[PDB]
Amino acid sequence: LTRFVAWLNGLKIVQPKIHRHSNLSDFDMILKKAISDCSLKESRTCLIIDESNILETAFLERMNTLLANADIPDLFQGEEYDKLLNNLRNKTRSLGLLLDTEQELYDWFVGEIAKNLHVVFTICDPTNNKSSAMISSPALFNRCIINWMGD
Amino acid sequence: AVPFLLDPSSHMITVISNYYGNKTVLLSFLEEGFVKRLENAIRFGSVVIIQDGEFFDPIISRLISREFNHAGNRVTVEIGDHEVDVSGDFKLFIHSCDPSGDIPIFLRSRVRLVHFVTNKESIETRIFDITLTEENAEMQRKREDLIKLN
Amino acid sequence: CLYKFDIESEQYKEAVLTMIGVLSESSDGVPKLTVDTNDDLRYLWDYVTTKSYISALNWFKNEFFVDEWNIADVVANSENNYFTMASERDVDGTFKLIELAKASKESLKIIPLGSIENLNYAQEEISKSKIEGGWILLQNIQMSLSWVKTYLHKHVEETKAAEEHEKFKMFMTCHLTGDKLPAPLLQRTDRVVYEDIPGILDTVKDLWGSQFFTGKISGVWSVYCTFLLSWFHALITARTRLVPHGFSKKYYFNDCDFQFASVYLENVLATNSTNNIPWAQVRDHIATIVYGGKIDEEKDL
Amino acid sequence: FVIEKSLNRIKKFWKEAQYEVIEHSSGLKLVREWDVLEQACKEDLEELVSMKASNYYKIFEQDCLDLESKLTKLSEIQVNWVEVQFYWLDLYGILGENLDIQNFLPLETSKFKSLTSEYKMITTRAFQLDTTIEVIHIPNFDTTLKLTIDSLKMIKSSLSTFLERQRRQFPRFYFLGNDDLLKIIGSGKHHDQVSKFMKKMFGSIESIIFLEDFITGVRSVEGEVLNLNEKIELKDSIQAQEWLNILDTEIKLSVFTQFRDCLGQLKDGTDIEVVVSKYIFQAILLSAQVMWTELVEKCL
Amino acid sequence: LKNCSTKEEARLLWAKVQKFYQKNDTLDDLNSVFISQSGYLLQYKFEYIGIPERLIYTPLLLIGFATLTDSLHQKYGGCFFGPAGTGKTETVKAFGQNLGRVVVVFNCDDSFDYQVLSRLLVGITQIGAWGCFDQFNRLDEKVLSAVSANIQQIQNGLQVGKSHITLLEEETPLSPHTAVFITLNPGYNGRSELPENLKKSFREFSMKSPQSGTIAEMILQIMGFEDSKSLASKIVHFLELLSSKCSSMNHYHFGLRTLKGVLRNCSPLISEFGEGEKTVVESLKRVILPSLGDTDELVFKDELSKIFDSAGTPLNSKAIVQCLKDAGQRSGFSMSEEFLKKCMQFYYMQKTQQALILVGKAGCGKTATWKTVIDAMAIFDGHANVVYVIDTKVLTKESLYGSMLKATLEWRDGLFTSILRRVNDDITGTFKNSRIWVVFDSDLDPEYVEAMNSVLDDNKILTLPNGERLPIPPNFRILFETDNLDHTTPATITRCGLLWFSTDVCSISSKIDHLLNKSYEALDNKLSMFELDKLKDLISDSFDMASLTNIFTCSNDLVHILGVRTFNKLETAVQLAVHLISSYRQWFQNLDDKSLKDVITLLIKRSLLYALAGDSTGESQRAFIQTINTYFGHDSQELSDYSTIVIANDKLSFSSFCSEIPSVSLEAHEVMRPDIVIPTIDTIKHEKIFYDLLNSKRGIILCGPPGSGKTMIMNNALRNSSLYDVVGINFSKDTTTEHILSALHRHTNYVTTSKGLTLLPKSDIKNLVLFCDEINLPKLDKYGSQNVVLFLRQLMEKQGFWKTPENKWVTIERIHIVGACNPPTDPGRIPMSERFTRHAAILYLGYPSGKSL
C-alpha cells in the first residue's frame, strides 16, 4: 500500500537492498544516493524502511539524524563536503540563483531534502525490542504520523 | 510458496537430494560463494536446498516472496543489485536444524513451515503401534494392507 | 508416584505426598491411618517415623519389586561393542571390570590414555582388538577429550562393522564430576555408573595386599609404618564421602598421595636413627604437604 | 536464451582485466590486490560449470568449453604466481638485504638471486602485455612458477633447518626467535650488538662488557657487575654459537669461583662488610647460607 | 631454635628449613653444592641471578618451598592454586633463586602465541632450566589442550627418565634438570584445576593468605626492628579493632593488603623520624585516616591512643599551612578547618603515594583541593607543576593508552602514552626538576586501570600492549577524581592512597564571595577600574548572608525537577545577577540610594528565584517568590510573578510596570513554519530569562515534557538576535561524541592561534550555541557512565577537550552548551551525574494551563 500510494503521487520508490553481509557503509551509500537524487536531481523519492532493514543501532541513529535534522552531517564531511558543495553550486546556478555564503547553499540543500524525501516505516510487531526501538526514538515518533493496521 | 524444513537430523535433506538426483545443489546461507552460486542456480533450473535456515539474508526476499518483473520471454528478479533470470525448472527449499534458532518474522510469514522433528507424542503413537503389534498382530497386519489394497 | 497416583485412589495419593513432604522439609502433615486398607503405606510411615532414612528411600525401590540388574547382567544382556561406565573419583570400576572379564571371556586388555605414545598405542590396539575380538578398556578417557572429539568420535560412528566384527566389547571410564563428553557419542554406547563403595576394613586390606608384591626393599620397621599408612589412607578416604559433617568440602585423595607418603616414610627411615621418636615431624609434613597440600579450608586441615 | 547474455558480460569483463602494479625498492615490481581477480576468475568458472545444467546450451557450449579451458589454466597460474610473490617477498627481508647473512649462507643467496633475475623477466614481460588473461599465452609461465615456488620452498627449508640446528647447538636461541637470531648472526662481525638480546635470552644479565678483543664480564638488569676469570678472546674466525656457549659455561664457572673465594674468606673469620665490596651478591649469598647452616648444625 | 622446649622440637623445626650443604668429598664442582629440606636433596646449579628483590621469609613461604621440593624429589611438577595476590609465581621465582636458577615465566593468554610457547618449551627442555606458567588457567581450549599435552609429555619423560621424548610431533632430548610449575588463579566458578592428564603429573598445593602477624613482624624487622614483635602485634590488633568498631563501608579495606601498604608507607617515613613506634603511628595516620569518614575518624583516634600513644605535635606544621594560605588567597577559596584538614592529608600522602585517589560527593571541592595543594607545592619547594587533566571515560582504551591498527600493525601513541614520552623520551626543557601530575576526572572502571596495573604496582613502569615498557619518574604522580567506588577492585585501592571527602569543604558564603570576585575579574575586562571599586563597596554594604541562610534552607522544602543540591546552585545565582547589574551599571543609571538600591535588590531577587527554584513546577515558583520577599528586607522592593523594569530609550526614566504584550498578525500561508511562535504572557518571560542566562555564558538545561515550547522558545529567542547563531543536534539512545563533532565541522573552523595552541571556534565571528535535544537519552557504559555527557561536561568545565585521533588539547572559543530533555522519571530516560549538571542552569517548562492553548 505504501508503494501504491507513492506511485499515485509520482514518487520514486526506494527500498533499501540490505542483507546479512551488509555493512554500515552500504547503508550510508544508499542514503547518500537517495539524498543526492532528491537534491541534485530533484527526484522526489519515497524511502520505505522495514524492521528487518535495521540490522544495527547505527542504522537507527542515521535515520534519527535524517529525520530530526533534514540532513546527515556524517555522510558529507571533508573531501566529500567539498565535492558536494561544488555540485551544489552547479545545480543552484542551473536553477537560476547564486547564493553568497557557504551556509546558504547548505540551507537550500536542506530545504530540498526536507521537501523531496518522504520516509515511510513498515514495522511489524511493536512487542519486539528491535521494533520497540523504532517507536521509542523521539525523532522518529515525533516527526512521523503513526498508523495502525495490526489485525 | 517456498517450504521450510525443520529436522534436527538432516535425514530429510538427503531425502530431497535423492528425489532430485544430480539436479540437487546444496548451499548454505553461511558459505562465501552463496550470494553468487544461487544467482547461477536460479538461472539454469537447479533444485537448490539451503542448508542453514536459522541465519537468512533479506537479499533472497524478492525470491521467497513471489515478486518478479515480466518481459516477453524472460522473467527476472532483483537480488542485491543484479537482475537475474528465473528458469522455471528451478525449485527452492530451506532447511534448518535447531528450533531454538529463530528465523526472521518476514520469512516465517512468507514461507510454509514444516516440522520433521521427533517429539514426545511420537512416543504415544509408536508405542500404540508396537502394543497392537504384540497384542493383536493379525488386525494390526490387516490395517496396513487395508489401505494399501484399497 | 506416577504409577500409584493414577491407579490407586486419591487418599493414597495425598498420604504418600504428605509422607514425601515429611522426608523433605516441605511439611509434616497428619497421615491417613486406615488399618488393613493399606499396610504397605503403614509400613512406609513406620520407616519414616523411626528416623531411619535409607530404608525409607529403599522402600520405593522395593515397591517396584524388580531384580535390579548388575553391571554384569547388563553387559550379558546388552549386544553392543561399546560401553561407558562413569563413576565418582572415589573409586574406579577397573578392577570390577577385571573380575567381570576373568569370570567369562577372559580376553582382558587395559589401555592408559596418557602420552602421545599411549594414544598411538591405544589407536593401534583398538583397530587390532576389534578384529581379534578381545575386551579392551580405555582408562579415564576424559583426560584426552580433545583426541576423542577427533578420533573416537569418528571411529565409533564409522564402526557399524564392529557389530559385524567378532564378539568384542570396548569399555570407557569417565568421571561424573569432570569434563563433559559429547552427547551423541555418549548415546551410541551403553551407559553405566559404578557405585560399589568398599568398606574401611576392605580398603585397608586392599592397600595392604599390594605392598608385599614389592618383595622386601625396606627394613622391618617400614612394614609397621606401611600398615599405619594403609589405615590412615583408608580412614581419610572413608571420611571423604561425608561432605557436610566430617570434611567441609568434598576432597579426593588418590593412590599418588599414598605413594608420596610412603616415599617420605622410607626416606625418614633411612636418614634417621632406628629410634621411634622422629614421629613428631612425620605428622607435620604428612598433615601439611602430602595430604594437607590439597586442603584449602582450615577446618579440614 | 540467457546463456548468451551471460557469456557476453564474461568476455567483456575479461577483456578488461588489469593488474595493479607498483615497484618496491629494488627493481622487481609487485602486483597488488590479488583476491579480486582470483575470486572473479573462480566465480566465472563456477558460472560456466553451472551453465552445464541448462538445456539451451548443447550447441552453444564449445565456445564456453574453450573459455573454461582458458580460465582453468589462468587460475592454475594464479595460485603459483601468488605463492611465488609471497615467498619471494618473505625471503627478501631475510636474504636480499644483509651482507653478513649471505656471507654465512652463500649458497642459498646464490640461488635466490638467480631466481630473482628470472622473476623480474617474467613479471615485466607479463605486465607489459596489458591483458591479465593473455598471460596464459606467454610460454613457460605455469612451469616457471611451479619450479620457482619449489626453489623458494627449498631455500626456506634450508633456512629453517639451519636456524633450528643453530638453536639446538646453543639452546638459549630458542628464547629469542627468528628475527633476533638473524640479527645476531648478522652482527657477529661487531660482537657488541649482541648485548641487547642477552637480556631476553638470559633474563638475569642486561649487557656484556668488552675490551673489543676479550670479554671482561657482564652486567645485570639490576646493575651489579660480574667479572669472568678467563676473559674470552674474540676473532673474526668465530661463530656466535661458539663464543656464546663458551660464555654460558664460563659464567657458571665464575659464579663458582667467587662463591668458593667468599666462603674460604669467611670461614677464616673475616667480616661480611669487607666481602660485600668485592664479591657479587650471589656468591656471598650462597657462602653465607652454607656457613650459616654449618654453624647452626654444630650449634644444634 | 633457642626458644625450643626440647631437642626434638629443635630438630623438627630444623628439618623444615632449607639447609645449604657442601660436598668437600668429590669432584664436579658445579655439582658440589646441594640443599636439604624435609629429608630431600636438590642439586644447586650455578646460573647467575643478580640482585632481585627477595621475598620476606615467612612460614608459609617455607611450607611452599617444602611442597615444591617434595614434588621435585619424585620428579613431579609443581603447582599451586590460590587467589590472585598470594604471590605464588613469586614463590616459584624465589625457590628458583635459592637454588641458583633463573625461572622463566610464561604470562599466558596475554596476547601470547602458541608457536613462541613451543619454542620456549623446547629451549627449556634442552637447557635444563625451570619453567613456570603464571595463571595457567587463563587460556583458550585449543591452546590449553595442546600445552597440556606437551607438558605431560615432558613430565612423563621425567618420571620415567627417557633420554629423548616426542612432543609437538618432534623427537627432542630432555635435560633431567628441567622442571615445570603451574600457578592457578580462581575463575568465576572457583579454584580452577589442572587438565585430567596433569593431575597425575603435578602436585596441587593450596595457598592461603598468610596470617598478617608474621609478615608484619618480618617486614618491621626488615625496615628497622626496634620492637618488631610488639609493633606487629599492636598494628594487627589496631587493624582488627578498626574493622571491629568502624562502620561497614564498601571502600574500607583493613586486610593484609592495607597493612602491607602501611609498612611500605612506613619505609620512607623512617627517614624522617626513626625506627620507632612513632613512625608506625604517623604512617597509620597518613594512610588510614584520609580514607575514613567523620563517624570513624574519632574511632580511629580513640583506638590508636588506646593501643599506643606516641606523639602530640607534628613536624612541618608552620610552613606548609602558610604556603596553603598564600595559594588559596590567590586562587579565591577560604581556609576552613575541613578544607585545611583535607589539604594537609593530601600533602602528607603525596610524599609516599605515587598514585592518589580522591572520592567525594559531586563538586566537593576535590578539584579545588588538589589544585590548591599543587599550587602551594609550587611555592614551598620551588618546583613547577605540569598538570594533565584527562576525562577517563570520554575516550576509549584505544585512544587513551594506545591503538595498534589491524593490517599495517602501526602502533599509534594515543593520549596517556603521548604525554608520558614528554617526560621520558625528550626532556629538552625543565622536566627533570618539575612535578608531573596526571589527573583522571571521569568515573574509573576496572577495564581502564588493569591496562596500567604495572604502573600502580611496585614496577612504576607502563607496559605497552606490544613493544615497550616506559618507566615513570618520582615526579610523575597519578590522581583519580571521581564520585563512586562501586566498580573498582580492592587491589586497585590498596595500590594507591585514598582520600575520602566525608562532607563539603567550606560553608556557603565563602564560595559566594569567591564567585563574586571571579565575576568582578570577568567584568574587569569591560568598563573601568573605579566603577569596579564602587560596585564592590556597594556589594559589601548590600547583603550579609543572614537573609540568604533561611532562603537556602527553605529551597530544600520544595519540589525540584532535575535535582541539584543547593550548594552547586550558587554559581548559577551570582553570575546572572552580576551580569544583570553590569548591564544596568552604565548608560541608564540613577543616583538615588533608595531607588538605586531598589533596582539592585530586584535584580538580585530575580536571579535568586531563577537560580534556586528555576527548576521547579512554576506553581511552586510563585510561592518561593513570596518566601524570598519574606526573608529579604521588608522595605526592599518585593517580587511579583511577571515583574519587569521599564526605562526610556533615549532619555533617563525610572519605573516598574509589567505585563505588556505586542500584537502579531500573519496571513494564511504563515500558519505552519519552523520559526513561527505566538508570544504569550509566558513566552516573553521564558525568552527573557533564557537570554539573560545565555548572556551569563553558563550552560543551560531545559527540562520538560515534549512540545512544551522548549524547542520553540529556544529557537525563537536566538533566531531574532544577531549575537548568537544556533546549531541543533538531536541525541538518541546511542549518540557518539563524533556525531557532535561532525555536526559542528560545518559551522566551525579550526585555527592555530598562539593564545590557545589549537583553537576550535565558529566559522564566523559571532557567538555559536549548540542545542542538544533529549540530552538524558544517550545510554551509558556497562558500568553505568555515559560518555557523551562527560564530553559535554569537559566542554563546559574545562572549556576544551582532547583530540580523539591526533592526541592533543583543543580549547573551544565562544561556544555555549544548551540542551533539552524530559524528566528522568519518564521511561527510557537515563539519570545524569550531578558532576555535569553542576555547571548548568535548570529551567522547567510544562504545558500552559490548558487555557492559554
Query: Taking the CB of residue D133, how many other CB atoms lie within 10 A of it?
Result: 18
Helix, strand and coil in chain E, % to nearest 5: 40, 15, 45
List, in order, residues 6 or more apart from C244 with CB less than 8 Å away: none
Cβ–Cβ under 8 Å, residues E660 and E680: no
Chain E CB contacts of A138 below 8 Å: 706, 730, 732, 773-774, 777
Measuring CA to CA, which residue among E634, E638, E563 is closest to residue E608? E638
Q: How far apart are CA D285 and CA D263, in angstroms?
A: 10
Decide: helix, strand or coil at residue E465.
coil
Q: A interface mutation test: which of B28, B39, B57 has the most A CBs within 10 A?
A: B57
E479-E484-E488 Cα angle (round to 5): 70
Q: Could you say which of B59, B105, B106 has the minimum Cβ distance to residue A17?
A: B59
- Please report which helix (H) or strand (E) contains residue C170, including its range: strand C170-174
Q: Quick check: E91 and E64 in contact, CB under 8 A?
A: yes
Measure CA of the first residue to CA of the last residue in chain A; give whole Å: 15
Instruction: Write down the H helix ranges in C244-301.
Output: 255-271, 279-285
Residue type, D255: V
Helix (H) or strand (E) holding D150: helix D142-169
Q: Are strands C108-112 and C135-139 parallel, antiparallel or unpaired?
A: parallel
Task: Collect contacts of E801-805 with beta carbons under 8 A, ≥24 apart.
Answer: E801/E394, E802/E390, E802/E391, E802/E394, E802/E395, E802/E415, E803/E758, E804/E395, E804/E399, E804/E737, E804/E738, E805/E399
Chains in contact with chain E (at least 3 beta-carbon pairs closer than 8 A): A, C, D
Query: Please, are residues A73 and A65 in contact by the beta-carbon 8 Å criterion?
Result: yes
For residue D290, give how far its alpha carbon lies from the nearest alpha carbon of chain E (Å). Answer: 5
**Cβ pair B25, B47 in contact under 8 A:** yes
| CA distances, A86 to each of A70, A95, C250, E365, E813 (Å) | 20, 15, 78, 52, 29
CA distances from C260 to B25, B84, D79 (A): 63, 76, 60
Q: Residue B50 contacts by C-beta under 8 Å, 6 or more apart in sequence?
A: B27, B28, B29, B92, B93, B94, B95
D46: closest chain B residue by CA? B37
CA distance D271 to D278: 13
> Among residues E351, E438, E354, E356, which one has the least CA distance to residue E400?
E438
Q: Can you tell me the distance from the alpha carbon of D190 to that of D210, in angstroms, rounded to the nearest whole number?
A: 11
The DSSP symbol for E111 reads S
Torsion angle defined by CA atoms of residues E743, E747, E751 and E756, in that order, rounded to the nearest 10 degrees? -70
Query: 619471494: which residue's cell?
Result: D88
Bridge partners of E43?
E34
Cβ of residue B33 closer than 8 Å to a chain D Cβ:
yes
DSSP E strand stretches across chain D:
20-23, 29-32, 205-209, 217-220, 225-227
DSSP string, E137-160: T---HHHHHHHHHHHHHHHHHHHH
The three cell numbers of residue E714 are 529556544
Residue C41 and residue C63 in contact, taking contact as beta carbons nearer than 8 Å: no
Q: With contact defined as beta carbons under 8 Å apart, do E687 and E718 qualify?
A: no
Secondary structure (DSSP) of C40-106:
HHHHHHHHHHTT-HHHHHHHHHHTTT--PPPHHHHHHH---SEEEEE--TT--THHHHHHHHHTSS-
- Helix%, strand%, coil% for chain B, nearest 5: 45, 20, 35
Give residues with Cβ within 8 angstroms of E686, minimum separation 6: E709, E713, E717, E843, E845
Question: Residue E46 and residue D252: Cβ atoms within 8 Å?
Answer: yes
Q: Do E197 and C114 touch (CB under 8 A)?
A: yes
Calculate the CA A72 to chain-centre distance.
8
Please state, in angstroms and rounded to a whole number, the distance separating the CA atoms of residues E739 and E760: 16
**In this structure, are residues E201 and E155 in contact, taking their beta carbons and an 8 Å threshold?**
yes
Inter-chain contact D53–B37, Cβ cutoff 8 Å? Answer: no
CB E369 within 8 A of CB E343: yes
D168/E315 Cα distance (integer angstroms) = 64
For strand E130-134 and strand E40-43, is the pairing parallel, antiparallel, or unpaired? unpaired
| E567-603 exposure pattern, b = at least 16 Cβ within 10 A, e = fewer | bbbbbbbbbbbbbbbbebbeebeeeeeeeebbbbbbb
Name the burial class of residue E276, with classes exposed (0-12), middle (13-18) and buried (19+) by CB atoms within 10 angstroms of its CB.
Answer: middle
Structure letter (DSSP) for residue E404 = E
Taking the C-alpha atoms of residue D185 and residue D162, their distance in angstroms, rounded to an integer, is 12
Angstrom distance (rounded) from CA E56 to CA C206: 46
CB neighbours of residue E480 within 10 Å: 25
What whole-number distance in Å separates Cα of residue D221 and Cα of residue E107? 20
**CATH number of the domain located at residue range(s) D4-186 in this protein:** 1.20.140.100
- The one-character DSSP state at E748 is B
Q: Is E75 exposed, middle or buried (0-12, 13-18, 19+ CB in 10 A)?
A: middle
Q: Which three cell numbers stand for residue D247?
A: 660464555
Minimum CA–CA partner of A111 in chain E: E674
Q: For chain A, give the number of residues.
A: 151
- In the structure, how many helices (H) and strands (E) does chain E have? 29, 28
Q: Is E759 exposed, middle or buried (0-12, 13-18, 19+ CB in 10 A)?
A: middle
User: In which element (H, E) is residue E812 found?
Assistant: strand E809-812
- Cβ neighbours of E12 in C, within 8 Å: 280-281, 284
Which residue in the block uniquely carries the three cell numbers 592461603? E208
Give the DSSP H or E segment for E22.
Answer: strand E19-22
Would you tell me the crossing angle of helices A129-136 and A57-67 to the nearest 10 degrees?
Answer: 20
Q: Which residue of A has its CA nearest to E707?
A: A142
What are C's interface residues with E at a Cβ cutoff of 8 A?
114-117, 140, 142-146, 175, 178-179, 254, 256, 259-260, 263-264, 267-268, 271, 277, 280-281, 284-285, 288-290, 293-296, 298
Residues 6+ apart with CB under 8 A from E749: E761, E762, E763
Cell numbers for E401:
593508552
Instruction: Give which of E343, E247, E356 is closest to E294, Cα–Cα.
Output: E247
- Long-range contacts from E418-424, C-beta under 8 angstroms, 24+ separation: E418/E807, E418/E808, E419/E388, E420/E462, E420/E470, E420/E472, E420/E476, E421/E470, E423/E472, E423/E473, E423/E475, E423/E476, E424/E470, E424/E471, E424/E472, E424/E473
Alpha carbon of residue E466 to chain centroid: 26
**How far is residue E502 from each of residues B77, D151, E632, measured CA to CA in Å?**
71, 76, 33
CB-based contact C125:C111 (threshold 8 Å) = yes
Contact yes or no for E52 and D222 at CB 8 A: yes
DSSP assignment of C225-246:
HHHHHHHHHHHHHHHTT-TTTT
Q: How are beta strands D225-227 and B92-96 bridged, if at all?
A: unpaired
Range E624-632, long-range pairs (CB < 8 A, 24+ positions): E624/E554, E624/E555, E624/E558, E627/E551, E627/E554, E628/E551, E629/E605, E631/E547, E631/E548, E631/E550, E631/E551, E631/E554, E632/E547, E632/E551, E632/E601, E632/E605
Q: Do chains D and E touch (3 or more CB pairs under 8 A)?
A: yes
- The set of long-range contacts for E708-715, using a CB threshold of 8 Å and a minimum separation of 24, is E708/E845, E708/E846, E708/E847, E709/E683, E709/E845, E709/E848, E710/E820, E710/E845, E711/E773, E711/E820, E712/E677, E713/E677, E713/E683, E713/E686, E713/E687, E713/E845, E714/E690, E714/E771, E714/E818, E714/E820, E715/E674, E715/E675, E715/E677, E715/E771
3-state secondary structure of E377: helix
Please list every residue in chain E followed by a chain break, i.e. its C lies more than 2.5 Å from the next written N: none
User: Which residues of E does the annotation place in the binding site?
Assistant: 82-89, 360-367, 704-711
Q: CA geometry: angle at D204 spanning D201 and D206, to 5°? A: 75
Q: In whole angstroms, what is the distance from residue C285 CA to residue C293 CA?
A: 9
By the 10 Å C-beta count (0-12 exposed, 13-18 middle, 19+ buried), E498 is classed as buried
Chain E interface residues facing chain A, Cβ-Cβ under 8 Å?
A: 706-707, 728-730, 732-735, 739, 742-743, 745-747, 763, 773-774, 777, 828
Q: Minimal Cα distance from C266: which residue of E?
A: E39
Q: How many other CB atoms are there within 10 angstroms of residue E196's CB atom? A: 18
Residue-wise burial string across D94-116, b where 16 or more C-beta atoms lie within 10 A, e elsewhere: bbbebeebbebbeebbebbeebb
CA dihedral E681, E685, E688, E690 (to 10 degrees): -130
| Residue E408 CA to its chain's centroid (Å) | 34
Cα separation, E483 vs E481, in Å, equals 7
Query: Closest residue of A to B104, CA-based?
Result: A52
Q: For residue D75, give the 3-state DSSP assignment.
A: helix
| 3-class SS of residue E795 | helix
Give yes or no for a contact between C239 and C247, defined as CB atoms under 8 angstroms apart.
yes
Residue E431, C-alpha cell as written in the block: 622536566
Q: Give Dmax over CA atoms of chain D in angstroms.
A: 109
User: How much of chain C is in helix, strand and coil states, percent to nearest 5?
Assistant: 55, 10, 40
Q: Is E604 left (phi over 0), alpha (psi -120 to 50) or beta?
A: alpha
Place of cell 536531481: A41
Contact residues for C191 (Cβ-Cβ < 8 A; gap 6+): C83, C84, C85, C86
> Which other chains touch chain D, taking contact as 3+ CB pairs less than 8 Å apart?
B, E
Method: X-ray
Residues E320, E347: contact at Cβ < 8 Å? yes
Q: Which residues contact E801 (CB under 8 A, 6 or more apart)?
A: E394, E791, E794, E795, E809, E810, E812
H or E stretch covering E390: strand E385-390
Is residue C96 a contact partner of residue C195, using CB atoms and an 8 Å limit? no
Query: Are the beta carbons of E8 and C277 separated by less than 8 Å?
Result: yes
Under 8 Å between Cβ of E802 and E809: yes
In chain E, the N- to C-terminal Cα span, in Å, equals 96
List binding-site positions of E for ATP. 82-89, 360-367, 704-711
The three cell numbers locating residue E427: 626532556
The number of residues in chain C equals 301
CB pairs under 8 A between B and D: 30
What is the full DSSP assignment across B70-103? E-SS-EEEEETTEEEE--SS--EEEEES-SSSPP
User: Can you say how many angstroms the Cα of residue E257 is from the centroid of all Cα atoms in its chain?
Assistant: 21
- Chain D neighbors of E100, CB-CB under 8 A: 255, 282, 286
**How far apart, in whole angstroms, are the C-alpha atoms of residue E173 and residue E162?**
9
CA-wise closest residue to E387 among E425, E335, E423, E347: E423
For C240, phi and psi rounded to 5 degrees?
A: -70, -30
Compare CB distances from A52 to B58, B80, B81 and report the shortest one's residue.
Answer: B58
Cell for C257? 598421595
CB E837 within 8 A of CB E792: no
At a CB cut-off of 8 Å and minimum separation 6, what does D251 contact? D218, D226, D228, E47, E48
Per-position b or e across E5-29, b if 16+ CB within 10 A of its CB:
eeeeebbbebbbbbbbbbeeeeeee
Quick one: chain A helix, strand, coil %, rounded to 5? 50, 10, 40
Contact E478, E358 (CB under 8 A): no
DSSP string, B33-55: THHHHHHHHHHTT-EEEES--SS
